[PDB]
Symmetry: C2
Subunit: 482 residues, 2 copies
Amino acid sequence: EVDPRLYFENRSKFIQDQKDKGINPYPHKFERTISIPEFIEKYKDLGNGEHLEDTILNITGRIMRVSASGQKLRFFDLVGDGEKIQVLANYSFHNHEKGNFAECYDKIRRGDIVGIVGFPGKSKKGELSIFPKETILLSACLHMLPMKYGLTEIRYRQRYLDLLINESSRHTFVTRTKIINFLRNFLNERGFFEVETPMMNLIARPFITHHNDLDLDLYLRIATELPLKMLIVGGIDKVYEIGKVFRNEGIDNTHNPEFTSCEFYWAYADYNDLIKWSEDFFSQLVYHLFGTYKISYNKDGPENQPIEIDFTPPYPKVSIVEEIEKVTNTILEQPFDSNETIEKMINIIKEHKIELPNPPTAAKLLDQLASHFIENKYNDKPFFIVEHPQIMSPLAKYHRTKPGLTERLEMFICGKEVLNAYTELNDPFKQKECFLDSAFCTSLEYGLPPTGGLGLGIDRITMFLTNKNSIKDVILFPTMRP
Amino acid sequence: EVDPRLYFENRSKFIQDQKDKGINPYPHKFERTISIPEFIEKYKDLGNGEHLEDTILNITGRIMRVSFDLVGDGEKIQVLANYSFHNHNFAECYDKIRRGDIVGIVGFPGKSKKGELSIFPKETILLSACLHMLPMKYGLTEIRYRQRYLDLLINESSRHTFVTRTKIINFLRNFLNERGFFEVETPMMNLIAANARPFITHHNDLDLDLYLRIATELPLKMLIVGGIDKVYEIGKVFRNEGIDNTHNPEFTSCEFYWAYADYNDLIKWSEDFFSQLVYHLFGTYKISYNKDGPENQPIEIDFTPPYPKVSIVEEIEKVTNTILEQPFDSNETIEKMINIIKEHKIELPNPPTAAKLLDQLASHFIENKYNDKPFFIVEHPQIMSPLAKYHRTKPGLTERLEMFICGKEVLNAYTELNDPFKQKLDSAFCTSLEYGLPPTGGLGLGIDRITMFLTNKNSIKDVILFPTMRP
Ligand SMILES: C[C@H]1CCC[C@H](C[C@@H]2Cc3cc(O)cc(O)c3C(=O)O2)O1
Ligand SMILES: C[C@H]1CCC[C@H](C[C@@H]2Cc3cc(O)cc(O)c3C(=O)O2)O1
Ligand SMILES: N[C@@H](CCCC[NH3+])C(=O)O
Ligand SMILES: N[C@@H](CCCC[NH3+])C(=O)O
Ligand SMILES: [Cl-]
């Protein structure tokens, strides 16, 4: 035990020595007849101690436990694609002509990738194993690997260690890819049409980069909203894009400078459809992934009791202003940026011991107030926070009966935002910035139909569905300090 | 012949006037019962002049011709607006409608005496006005790229072009997933960035200058090490470099990495995947392609496997009456190549490294050996190819391939190099290789060039929706 991190020294040597002896310890091809998970699937049902000696198979995996037993009989745990089988290497069954048994297995360390030629069977004890007549070294593992339960900050830097050791890690990311596919199939079913828009435009704080043979400073997209709308105008009535978006700001458990987003835009759809949409999409994904609508989620971390979140539609809808009003014994007279009212809000913020932001714009004052009182109204369910004001919501179309508000929604899971959508604004005159892009503004003048449109935070969604407290856990190689 | 300046102003006025009259010319919702393409599909088979007057339908589209022509989702139907049927003033409710306007109609389906399939309005609402005058059909420059929504609205080919792009991508995603691959997302921004100049940007609350990925190769390999034996990613990659017909600073790529697969597997792969996509999209393996532009006769490109394979060195050698003795970066040989470049009147690059000298020589002689078929250019040397594993029988070469269509590169792939000692890059990636990368084959596709050929376009600008233009 306790190797002095000289394993590398004594492996890097061992490699060169293998080259010196005429051997190639990194051979080009190994023609395999079967993947581990297939192996398990087609031999799960053998009787303890039954060998199929007339079946010669070629298999590959990574060694993960070199157990030894006798001298003329040696074990190994072999893994591939998230699964394990045993190897039982018997001096008796070993094809001697190719090589001396002891010296063909004395070589194999933990981590090594091997290629075995064997027959399938079960041990007396009933462990399903491969039985090698021959074992080739395909790609050595030069370093000592962490033991099971070995894992820190190393997970994120070196994901390949997480994926190799912690059976949950693999699951976590297999779930991410599921979700994304589910959604793509969800949307394509409904007739939507995936496109790609530009990552860099000419205009949240942005990431700014230069194009050398262009002499123009460009900007990494803070979102996918604008071009898609320009495409609705193009006459792609149902259009979406899944993909990375870049926001220069603080990093924390629910914040990464680059993150995956989906936005779809559905011509001829009002706010009500997007609520029907969201309730239908969330529930179905959750049912798809767990067979039940309810799930468990360790909000306060895995050392603390989980909570149960219930995705059965419908979900609640809360009117942001009416709640803050209700909950503060207060009226918030319009317009919100009026003098009288901003003070009334700052008065509230301080008097409930909460952090004032600078600038104190009514838009930001609302958001804070919301994020204190309302956002954690329900953890045990997802719910919507609807009808935000126009001065929070400048692409959101003016609500049709209620003055001052828009027809917008935001779905919240356990305090955090994961969907944001609204009846789009399509009337160029009402766009206060247009009287944004010169290009986008113009399009609106070519005539945007009534449209509803919706945005999802892929990672936060993934986070909840994979019981992670950090967004760093559900991204494969998050951006770390050096 | 109207002026476009005032047209905007007179419509902008017309909107305000509508609001003054209590009318809302941008109404929130119109509950439609049917899409145009559905309308066509469920009434294609009416007799000329037959009305189904007891069927009241709600439909929407964009007006495109006053005589009215109505379009939605790439298709057109007629509108016939009759005093006979109008729910009562008719003239003043339709004198209002301009070309471009989006409307919502309440009508019944039927055919004109002449057999044109149409909707018949009792009522027509203005849903979203078109404030500008639109291009006449067959009146469309640089405007296509800046304002794509005009291209998509007028030129029935444009829509096709992009519908094809999204097809291809889906075909490939289903192609790969079928075979067991596992889509992932890697980072767009790395600490250290193929051989290409990078886009460089700063993270504010990290206080650090990061690099837009020039490719997806490295992390995927680090994932192979992770034990995702079949892994792929489709997505944008950023290269600070020249723009032209087959070049955009940002472009879509797909790279998959296939553990335990040799270089040959990737040939089988590519020949499969190309042929099948081509068969999938056109029903035949052969396509037509206006290489020299649409004013010039097309050529026929034949995707029936197998495709040819050409040994880069052996060809340049063969074609130049020349031996190119190893090592290539030797003194004697570089000269022998520069001698060749000048003496066949071709542009020398600086630096004159043997790696670049090869590439040029290749791109002149070999790359246009076949236009009428796709073909492979295999076994590049190690000094061109530093992630490519050393070819197993031939010294000096690697086990690499590159599929070329009509002179242009669209696939690049090799038996990966997995032996850290032989690697002459990220401290992170290197390290992974020391944890032990199995034999793996891996492959890269240029989504946009592939699209370009399959959609008969001379420019890569045509198959990207909003290409990056100068203002
Ligand atoms: C496209 C929108 C749609 C609503 C859901 C989501 C809202 C937030 C935004 C965000 C910002 C940011 O700076 C770092 C993030 O990680 C996230 C994130 O995951 O979700 O993304
Ligand atoms: C994934 C790789 C594999 C070879 C096929 C293709 C090669 C080039 C890449 C490239 C570079 C560049 O700086 C500007 C580009 O437009 C393109 C492009 O789209 O074609 O993509
Ligand atoms: N751009 C929005 C998502 C789309 C909302 C509806 N247009 C966001 O990032 O929140
Ligand atoms: N990174 C390569 C594609 C993968 C080739 C095989 N590892 C390129 O951009 O050409
Ligand atoms: Cl070979």
